[PDB]
């Protein structure tokens, strides 16, 4: 619709995986927890949430 | 070593020209009034003296013996006759050499080069030129012309500070010079090789006799250009059990029925299209007049219908079988792309006109695939080329017109692809009326589901898909068909009075169908369809090899026109 | 004048030599005045090369030149006074105030 | 007796001989001296055989050694290998015109009628300032004439060995080597570096390797793996294990690189087993992956892309060489890839002027250039692999022939199309994400090269009946020509020499699974209406939108309206214009 | 003339320099001082311009048919002249001075290659630009220099290279960790001269940290990188965040839209002013 833009791609899923790996790398951990994916999805949704303002 | 041999060969050449009254003395006596001095000497007529040894010694040292030959010619015309330029041309060599057999062992010798002209240049004034010095009023007249044309080695007054440099003049001196492009012929190209082209220079009055887009044969001298190996021509010409098979093939009665199924053995069905393609190849008389103008004596064939048919297969056959056949894709063409393209200021020199697809392969079939996706400019150029037989090119100040006689094989498609029966040919073909005209025959092909011939067509398609089957086997090969086409081409038949008296009633019978029409009728009938059936009459007379046509063979052409 | 500079602009002119050392430089107009003011009339006739140069020396006040032998930068803390004219020749209040300047938004 | 002065010598025979092992180890480092003394010894042993002498006393004979071992091209040619014999195997791409070289020099004087002939001494001409002192003295009166000088043939030839080496041929070997052939060549490596050819091999009981060498145990493994039933899917799974199934698409690219059968006539006919494929549908899937993977499989192919490859870049062209200051006939991308595949992405964004050359290579497989300097038809034997995108951004409410924005007869001439649409749902994309994270949790080319060069399958008449009916289902000739090449490629894999009846069944399933109105109708309907009610005058954009949302129902959004309108007009299903002005189609 | 081998050198490391208690220090091209022309130097830097391998002669061999004594002359400069006059030991005591010819086989050549070393990004001073320097290599080292890398070149300075190679702190990382909320502190620490936008610059923090490059080990490599767009209206600062990211991160290069950008994003060709070749 009117406020829409693009669609979900597998490269965005790979970028979400890469951002979760970067968040786990910033915490200096050997494993990826549940806290990184929920931060990355919040990041990619608030990256487009400013259009409603 | 040739300084004492040149006077002896000059004496031998003038003895050859003096002792024969050969036709050379009357040729000089004829040109005495016109003073052109562009003589023609046959090499076959020169090959009999000194048991051919005079011809073999001149034949390798031609550039080293050429001023002695022109001095001997000058002395014999100075003694037999009272602004002086000379041109000696040699012709009719017994061996025809290709462009791929040129080596460096024939540098400076004479050679016969045959091929096709690709491009032509403008005529230019060549120098051949007084030189002034900037220190005094000295002048010179002994000029060199090939190379080193700026530095003469002598002055009449040796008292000078610099004896080397001089200054040229454009006042006291200068004729036509041309540079054309010759290329390898299509029948003698090696397998996988490229048709290598070369530039040939030409002087004297041998210029503007070579038409662009024709097979030509030159005779000249191999001269190197800084290096590159160019050529200099002096003569121009527009060239381009067997009878036991031909006399056996003209005495039977079922030849035409095998000819209509042997002109395209790879196509199943479509006898009318094969009839028009077979009668397209050979035409009739073009000079049938008393006024003095040539007429359109050729056959124009255009194929239309739904896509995915076998109508392009004929297109792929003509070009693989007819030697005088040029094929174009239509979309990869233009007005200059089809007739004559021009280069625009490339490599330092001026403009050069390259020959396109049109005016090539005269009295042959030019086949254009996808005729309706072309532009308006090339289609009105085709209409200008069909309205008059000659074609005119006006570019860069020069105007040049030339003779052209080609038959158009136009493959077209509708605006929607599928051919609908409910309307005329004009609204479905989508092209204007003057370019729709001057077309002798239209072939409409419609397809549907008719299993009895469809299963045979699909079986022929799958039986063709194997290594060289006999499923597309004709009753006789193309080996006698090529000489039969040539023998029927040189026939020139003459129509009769009974055929004309039946033809006027047949034209009245064909025009009677226009009355209460719009059922079994789709186009108008005027003088053009009458001209089409008149041109098909001599084509069927040539195909049946009869000198005087009977109206029964024109009845099949009437039925062919009724079938369309 | 804003148009007519022999070099590449009013900074970093032509570099050539004929003596023993085959390298020589040249100073422009903006590199001479280091604390004063410079005035450019006919701003719309000034080309893009000097526009890229004043895009860089506006709020940074330094000019960097990457030559074959010279790879240094220098201070350009000066103040510019530009005078321009429209491309239409005349201007009134009823016309829009953005397209009449005929300059980019970065220069505004 | 026939006059052939050339002698072809095999060096391997000099290698295995008991007495000449010291000669083979002497000619590899110094060929220029041994060829010059071999010319004297061959004439001496020939006159010893004679003891016809009136012509062999002045005749010269040479030796062309070619039987030497292989080398690693120009990469192994180190500077210790200068002036040594070397052999290169490859293909030539460009043949320059013949240049002349001076053998003797002519010297014409301006005075005293004395001409002087001198010879070349390996590159330098001794110009005499003196003027033959028995005759009169002159300090600088001397000229040079080019037309009386004797010349020899020379030619520089471009060779693709990937590197491009400039080799140079001389007299009696000119016009024997030209672009288009697999040529073994041998000569002396010189120094910019070049190779001075002593022999060429235009043709090919020996162990000269032709194809990629296989053994008997590998052939037994190929025969044992070719007898299984699931090989038809095994290969389609082993061609790309990093991505998903794509059965029809992977099976098509597998049999596309299998090729088929290329049969010809003696003089005027040729046919190649080939399929030109096109891909269209939903984006962001493995398309580019494939477009790269195949470039990593074939040994010949170019990655041409969008508007960056025009008509001067696709086919051959002419330019200027900076290394020799001459004209260079540079090879084009369609003739650089003569054999193998060629990958094109963004087919819809490509121009219409360069579509005419691919219109000939669809089934004609030829390039016919008729321009300034060149009138040449040439081979275009490669197969295209093109990835395209639809109009907009997929729409199942629109037909397939209008959604991808292309002409229909050129697409009818396409051998294979591929609907690679996603149509996202459950249980298919979950496995997709699981397989992409499963690697985040922690023989084929030999068989293909053996099958492509060892099997020539024939299409018998026994598979006639099932083909006719497979054609009429699409008819209720390009499809028939595509399916016979598809059936012979089905016969190409699984080691078969005769085609079978079951093999076309799957082929057709292939082309039936590879391809699997209200709006515009109402649209036109209304257009017609407002035309009628306009006394045929134009329908307005506004009134259009108005009645079209007005009759409300199926919700025609003015944007959608704009789109379909655009479609019909562009379809010339409509003819209209203006900014905020709408005109009814005519 | 009979040199079968090629002689090269390599310096000592710092580990052998601290042991037994300089000669091999990592030198900049701004740290050359002029007076180091003739010392062995180890320079660190990126390589942008490389040339093709070409055979350069060292000694020219001339052969004669009159005497047989082949002579050899030694060249040192870029150019030379042909010695057409015979300087043999037999033609000095003779009236005849017969022609000499050259041999491309007995002459000793060398695989010569020129390269342009550039100054490192964080080693250049404030405001200065990374100027270049020329390195002339010969012999077997000719294929050890592939462009697009960081190298340490040890050689004499006329640059004739001899050997090439390629690639307190714990308290500084533990005091940054122990303060608590490491991610938000490192987010709000970079670029504090702007207002807010912790999310955009938080993703810029994840952008410059990069991520993990994944290799399947079967001939397929995927990206382990992020690419961030900043689409905005004017009024908020955009070049400041970009400049702070390029100033904090190493090897950050500021680009532009128009200008020489068409040749500033690809490799073009030009004529060298020091020699007759295209680079």
């Amino acid at each position: 619709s009117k406020f829409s833009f693009g669609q979900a791609t597998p490269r965005t899923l790979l970028g979400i995986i890469r951002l979760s790996q970067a968040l786990a790398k910033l915490r200096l951990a050997d494993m990826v927890d549940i806290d990184d994916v929920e931060e990355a999805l919040r990041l990619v949704r608030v990256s487009k949430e400013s259009l409603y303002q | 070593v040739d300084d004492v041999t040149g006077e002896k060969v000059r004496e031998a050449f003038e003895q050859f020209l003096e002792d024969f009254s050969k036709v050379y003395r009357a040729q000089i006596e004829f040109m005495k009034i016109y003073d052109l001095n562009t003589i023609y000497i046959d090499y076959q007529h020169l090959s009999m003296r000194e048991n051919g040894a005079l011809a073999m010694a001149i034949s390798e040292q031609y550039y080293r013996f050429l001023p002695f030959l022109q001095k001997g010619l000058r002395r014999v015309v100075r003694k037999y006759a009272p602004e002086r330029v000379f041109q000696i041309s040699f012709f009719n060599l017994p061996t025809v050499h290709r462009i791929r057999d040129i080596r460096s062992e024939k540098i400076g010798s004479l050679l016969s080069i045959s091929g096709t002209v690709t491009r032509t240049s403008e005529v230019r004034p060549e120098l051949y030129a007084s030189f002034t010095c900037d220190m005094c009023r000295a002048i010179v007249d002994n000029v060199e012309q090939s190379f080193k044309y700026t530095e003469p080695t002598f002055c009449p007054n040796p008292s000078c500070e610099n004896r080397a440099f001089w200054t040229l003049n454009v006042t006291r001196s200068f004729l036509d010079w041309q540079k054309v492009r010759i290329q390898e012929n299509a029948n003698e190209i090696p397998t996988g090789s490229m048709p290598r082209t070369l530039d040939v220079i030409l002087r004297g009055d041998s210029v503007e006799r070579a038409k662009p887009g024709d097979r030509c044969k030159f005779t000249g001298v191999e001269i190197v250009v800084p290096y590159k190996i160019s050529f200099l021509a002096c003569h121009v010409i527009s060239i381009g059990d067997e009878i036991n098979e031909l006399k056996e093939m003209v005495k039977d009665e079922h030849i035409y029925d095998k000819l209509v199924r042997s002109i395209a053995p790879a196509v199943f069905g479509h006898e009318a299209v094969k009839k028009g393609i077979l009668l397209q190849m050979l035409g009739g008389v073009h000079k049938s007049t008393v006024e003095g103008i040539k007429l359109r004596g050729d056959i124009n064939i255009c194929v239309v219908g739904d896509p995915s048919t076998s109508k392009s297969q004929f297109l792929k056959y003509v070009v693989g079988f007819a030697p005088r056949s040029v094929y174009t894709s239509g979309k990869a063409s233009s007005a200059a792309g089809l007739t004559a393209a021009v280069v625009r200021d490339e490599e330092g020199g001026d403009y050069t006109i390259e020959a396109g697809a049109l005016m090539l392969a005269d009295n042959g079939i030019c086949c254009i695939d996808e005729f309706d996706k072309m532009d308006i400019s090339d289609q009105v150029a085709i209409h200008e080329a069909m309205e008059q037989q000659t074609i005119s090119i006006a570019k860069a100040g020069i105007h040049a017109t030339l003779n052209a006689r080609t038959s158009i094989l136009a493959a077209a498609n509708p605006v929607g692809g599928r051919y609908n029966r409910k309307l005329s040919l004009r609204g479905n073909l989508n092209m204007t009326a003057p370019i729709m005209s001057r077309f002798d025959l239209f072939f409409v092909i419609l397809d549907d589901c008719n299993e009895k011939i469809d299963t045979e067509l699909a079986s022929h398609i799958v039986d063709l898909h194997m290594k060289r089957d006999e499923a597309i086997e004709p009753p006789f090969s193309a080996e006698q068909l090529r000489r039969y086409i040539k023998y029927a081409r040189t026939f020139k038949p003459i129509l009769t009075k009974e055929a004309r008296s039946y033809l006027v009633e047949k034209y009245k019978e064909l025009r009677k169908d226009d009355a209460q029409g719009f059922s079994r009728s789709s186009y108008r009938i005027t003088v053009r369809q009458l001209e089409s059936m008149i041109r098909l009459s001599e084509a069927i007379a040539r195909a049946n090899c009869v000198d005087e046509i009977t109206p029964s063979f024109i009845a099949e052409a009437y039925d062919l026109l009724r079938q369309s | 004048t804003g148009r007519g500079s022999s070099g590449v602009g009013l900074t970093a002119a032509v570099t050539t030599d004929r003596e023993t050392g085959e390298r020589r430089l040249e100073a422009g107009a903006m590199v001479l005045a280091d604390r004063g003011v410079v005035c450019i009339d006919e701003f719309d006739k000034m080309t893009d090369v000097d526009r890229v140069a004043i895009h860089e020396v506006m709020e940074q006040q330094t000019v960097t030149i990457a030559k074959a032998g010279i790879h240094t930068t220098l201070n350009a803390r000066c103040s510019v006074i530009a005078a321009a004219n429209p491309v239409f020749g005349q201007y009134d209040v009823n016309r829009d105030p953005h397209q009449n300047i005929a300059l980019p938004d970065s220069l505004l | 007796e026939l006059g052939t002065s050339n002698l072809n010598l095999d060096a391997r025979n000099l290698l295995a001989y008991k007495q000449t092992e010291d000669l083979y180890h002497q000619l590899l480092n110094y060929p220029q001296e041994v060829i010059s003394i071999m010319d004297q010894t061959i004439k001496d042993c020939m006159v010893s055989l004679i003891v016809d002498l009136d012509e062999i006393e002045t005749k010269f004979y040479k030796v062309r050694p070619y039987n030497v071992g292989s080398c690693k091209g120009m990469r192994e040619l180190n500077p210790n290998d200068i002036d040594k014999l070397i052999n290169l195997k490859g293909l030539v791409l460009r043949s320059t015109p013949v240049i002349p070289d001076m053998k003797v020099a002519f010297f014409k004087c301006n005075v005293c009628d004395h001409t002087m002939a001198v010879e070349i001494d390996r590159g330098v001409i001794q110009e005499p300032a003196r003027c033959e002192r028995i005759d009169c003295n002159e300090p600088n009166s001397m000229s040079l004439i080019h037309n009386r000088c004797s010349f020899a043939d020379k030619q520089v030839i471009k060779l693709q060995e990937p590197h491009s080496i400039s080799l140079c041929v001389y007299d009696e070997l000119v016009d024997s080597c030209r672009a288009g052939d697999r040529i073994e060549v041998t000569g002396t490596f010189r120094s910019k570096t070049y190779v001075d050819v002593v022999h060429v091999k235009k043709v090919s009981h020996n162990e000269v390797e032709e194809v990629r060498q296989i053994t008997d145990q590998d052939l037994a493994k190929i025969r044992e793996v070719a007898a299984r039933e699931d090989l038809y899917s095994l290969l389609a799974r082993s061609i790309a294990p990093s991505i998903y199934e794509l059965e029809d698409v992977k099976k098509g690219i597998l049999l596309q690189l299998f090729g088929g059968t290329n049969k010809t006539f003696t003089k005027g006919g040729r046919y190649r087993g080939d399929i030109n494929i096109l891909l269209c549908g939903d984006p962001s899937t493995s398309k580019s992956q494939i477009l790269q993977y195949v470039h990593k499989i074939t040994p010949r192919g170019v990655y041409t892309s969008g508007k960056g490859s025009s008509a001067v870049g696709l086919t051959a062209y002419i330019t200027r060489d900076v290394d020799t200051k001459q004209l260079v006939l540079e090879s084009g991308a369609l003739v650089l890839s003569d054999g193998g595949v060629c990958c094109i992405d963004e087919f819809d964004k490509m121009s219409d002027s360069t579509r005419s050359v691919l219109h000939e290579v669809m089934e004609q497989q030829t390039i016919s250039i008729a321009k300034a300097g060149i009138i040449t038809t040439l081979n275009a034997r490669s197969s295209i692999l093109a990835s395209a995108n639809p109009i907009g951004s997929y729409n199942p409410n629109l037909p397939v022939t209008e959604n991808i924005d292309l002409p229909p007869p050129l697409l009818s001439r396409f051998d294979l199309v591929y609907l690679v649409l996603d149509k996202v749902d459950e249980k298919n994309d979950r496995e997709l994400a699981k397989h992409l994270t499963n690697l985040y949790l922690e023989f084929l080319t030999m068989y293909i090269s053996y099958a492509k060069e060892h099997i020539h399958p024939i299409i018998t008449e026994a598979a006639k009946t099932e083909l006719v009916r497979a054609y009429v289902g699409m008819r209720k000739t390009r499809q028939l020509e595509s399916m016979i090449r598809l059936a012979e490629a089905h016969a190409k894999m699984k080691l078969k020499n005769v085609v079978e009846l079951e093999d076309v069944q799957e082929a057709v399933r292939l082309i039936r699974s590879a391809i699997k109105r209200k709006l515009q109708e109402d649209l036109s309907r209304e257009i017609m209406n407002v035309l009628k009610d306009q006394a045929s005058d134009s329908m307005s954009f506004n009134e259009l939108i108005k009645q079209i949302n007005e009759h409300s129902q199926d919700r025609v959004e003015s944007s959608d309206i704009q789109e379909a309108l655009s479609r019909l007009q562009q379809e010339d299903k409509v003819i209209v214009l203006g900014e905020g002005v709408r005109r009814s189609v005519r | 003339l009979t040199r079968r081998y090629f002689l090269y050198f390599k310096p000592l490391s710092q580990n052998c320099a601290r042991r037994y208690r300089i000669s091999s220090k990592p030198l900049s091209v701004r740290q050359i001082k002029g007076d180091f022309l003739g010392q062995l130097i180890t320079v660190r830097g990126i390589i942008t311009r490389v040339s093709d391998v070409k055979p350069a002669v060292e000694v020219i061999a001339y052969t004669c048919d009159q005497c047989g004594y082949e002579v050899f002359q030694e060249v040192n400069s870029r150019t030379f002249t042909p010695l057409s006059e015979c300087t043999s030991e037999e033609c000095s005591q003779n009236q005849t001075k017969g022609q000499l010819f050259m041999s491309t086989r007995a002459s000793k050549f060398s695989a010569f290659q020129e390269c342009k070393i550039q100054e490192l990004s964080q080693q250049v001073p404030v405001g200065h630009i990374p100027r270049s320097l020329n390195i002339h290599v010969n012999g077997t080292l000719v294929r050890s220099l592939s462009p697009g890398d960081i190298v340490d070149v040890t050689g004499i300075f006329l640059l004739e290279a001899q050997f090439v190679r390629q690639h307190d702190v714990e308290e500084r990382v533990m005091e940054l960790i122990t303060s608590g909320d490491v991610y938000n502190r490192l987010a709000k620490s970079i670029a504090p001269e702007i207002y807010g936008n912790l999310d955009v610059k938080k993703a810029l923090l994840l952008l410059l940290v990069g991520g993990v490059d994944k290799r399947v080990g079967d001939g397929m490599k995927i990206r382990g990188d992020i690419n961030v767009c900043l689409m905005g209206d004017p009024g908020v600062a955009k070049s400041q965040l970009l400049k702070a990211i390029c100033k904090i991160s190493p090897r950050g290069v500021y680009t532009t839209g128009k200008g020489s950008s068409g040749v500033g994003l690809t490799a073009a060709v030009m004529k060298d002013p020091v020699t007759d070749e295209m680079i």
Side-chain angles (χ1 to χ4, degrees), chain E residues 173-250 252-262 264-279:
Chain E
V173 67
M174 262 85 86
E175 73 200 332
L176 191 135
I177 285 158
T178 195
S179 69
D181 202 1
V182 185
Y183 185 47
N184 210 357
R185 169 181 198 209
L186 284 176
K188 76 181 166 287
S189 165
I190 42 170
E193 303 160 8
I194 57 155
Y195 171 66
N197 58 95
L198 288 149
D199 189 82
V200 179
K201 187 248 295 175
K202 222 169 59 171
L204 287 178
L205 172 62
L206 298 160
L207 158 78
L208 62 80
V209 80
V212 187
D213 307 340
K214 181 59 78 168
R215 188 174 182 184
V216 80
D218 211 3
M220 171 195 174
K221 295 176 193 171
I222 44 177
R223 53 186 211 102
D225 213 346
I226 326 287
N227 300 307
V228 195
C229 266
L230 307 180
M231 181 78 63
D233 49 340
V236 69
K238 297 277 106 180
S239 176
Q240 306 310 109
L241 282 86
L242 180 132
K243 194 71 172 187
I245 281 297
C246 290
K247 258 184 63 60
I248 283 157
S249 68
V253 172
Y254 170 64
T255 66
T256 175
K258 224 192 279 191
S260 161
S261 60
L265 284 176
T266 191
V269 75
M270 69 98 67
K271 196 172 72 187
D272 218 13
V274 73
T275 175
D276 47 357
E277 79 191 352
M278 292 285 176
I279 51 167

Side-chain angles (χ1 to χ4, degrees), chain B residues 273-286:
Chain B
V273 193
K274 281 159 184 162
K275 265 188 282 183
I277 276 157
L278 171 69
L279 288 176
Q280 180 185 8
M281 296 208 73
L282 77 171
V285 56
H286 58 91

Side-chain angles (χ1 to χ4, degrees), chain D residues 255-264 266-405 407-422 424-440:
Chain D
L255 66 97
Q256 191 267 317
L257 64 98
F258 262 126
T261 320
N262 312 330
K263 298 284 111 175
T264 178
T266 55
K267 185 162 258 208
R270 55 186 303 257
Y271 283 100
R272 294 188 65 97
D274 198 273
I275 43 160
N276 288 318
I277 71 160
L278 190 135
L279 277 80
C280 63
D282 291 319
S284 80
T285 61
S286 76
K287 270 88 68 182
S288 69
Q289 294 311 298
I290 305 162
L291 282 157
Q292 281 306 111
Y293 174 63
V294 74
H295 184 85
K296 293 168 186 302
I297 286 299
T298 193
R300 217 170 299 277
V302 285
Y303 190 70
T304 74
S305 291
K307 301 194 182 305
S309 64
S310 186
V312 79
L314 258 299
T315 191
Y317 62 98
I318 178 74
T319 172
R320 182 176 287 271
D321 197 74
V322 77
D323 300 336
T324 190
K325 216 195 172 188
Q326 276 295 320
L327 281 181
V328 63
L329 282 81
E330 280 208 3
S331 166
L334 272 168
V335 74
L336 177 63
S337 57
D338 186 76
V341 311
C342 53
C343 41
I344 308 167
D345 43 346
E346 302 93 23
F347 206 73
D348 50 344
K349 287 154 187 167
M350 194 196 64
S351 175
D352 299 332
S353 52
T354 181
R355 206 167 260 118
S356 198
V357 61
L358 54 90
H359 192 277
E360 197 178 351
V361 314
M362 277 304 112
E363 280 307 306
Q364 295 206 32
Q365 304 291 137
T366 50
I367 305 280
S368 65
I369 311 164
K371 66 179 194 278
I374 171 161
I375 61 171
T376 302
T377 167
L378 54 93
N379 317 110
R381 317 174 164 108
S382 180
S383 60
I384 294 169
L385 199 145
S387 81
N389 287 337
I391 205 164
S393 65
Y394 189 77
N395 201 4
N397 308 320
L398 288 182
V400 198
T401 76
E402 201 267 338
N403 207 10
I404 37 180
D405 211 13
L410 165 73
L411 255 298
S412 77
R413 280 180 77 229
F414 261 94
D415 283 341
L416 195 47
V417 288
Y418 271 123
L419 213 58
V420 69
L421 86 167
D422 205 0
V424 282
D425 46 336
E426 288 86 4
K427 310 277 176 180
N428 282 328
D429 303 320
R430 177 177 88 213
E431 212 173 345
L432 162 148
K434 273 173 175 173
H435 191 71
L436 256 175
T437 190
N438 261 325
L439 72 147
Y440 263 113

Side-chain angles (χ1 to χ4, degrees), chain B residues 136-169 171-182 184-186:
Chain B
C136 72
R137 288 172 199 271
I139 207 58
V140 285
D141 275 329
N142 296 125
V143 175
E144 51 267 11
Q145 55 96 27
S146 69
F147 206 56
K148 64 188 181 296
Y149 75 106
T150 59
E151 308 297 290
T153 182
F154 202 47
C155 47
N157 287 347
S159 178
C160 174
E161 49 262 53
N162 210 348
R163 219 176 53 192
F165 83 109
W166 290 71
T167 42
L168 78 156
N169 188 20
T171 305
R172 184 55 179 86
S173 176
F174 268 4
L175 52 88
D176 38 14
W177 171 95
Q178 213 183 349
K179 180 198 73 161
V180 293
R181 192 66 68 93
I182 191 61
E184 177 48 60
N185 204 8

Side-chain angles (χ1 to χ4, degrees), chain E residues 73-104 106-125:
Chain E
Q73 75 246 40
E74 172 202 352
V75 300
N76 215 1
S77 86
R78 195 186 294 271
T79 184
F80 71 104
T81 173
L83 207 76
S84 298
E85 207 271 330
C86 189
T87 57
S88 56
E89 282 83 9
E90 213 275 342
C91 281
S92 62
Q93 52 274 17
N94 211 352
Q95 180 183 8
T96 56
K97 279 182 185 65
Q99 217 172 8
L100 263 284
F101 295 131
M102 52 171 53
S103 176
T104 173
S107 297
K108 175 190 172 70
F109 292 93
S110 289
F112 182 75
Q113 189 167 286
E114 57 100 21
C115 171
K116 257 175 62 173
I117 184 76
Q118 276 203 3
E119 178 60 32
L120 201 145
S121 296
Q122 81 195 20
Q123 282 192 354
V124 73

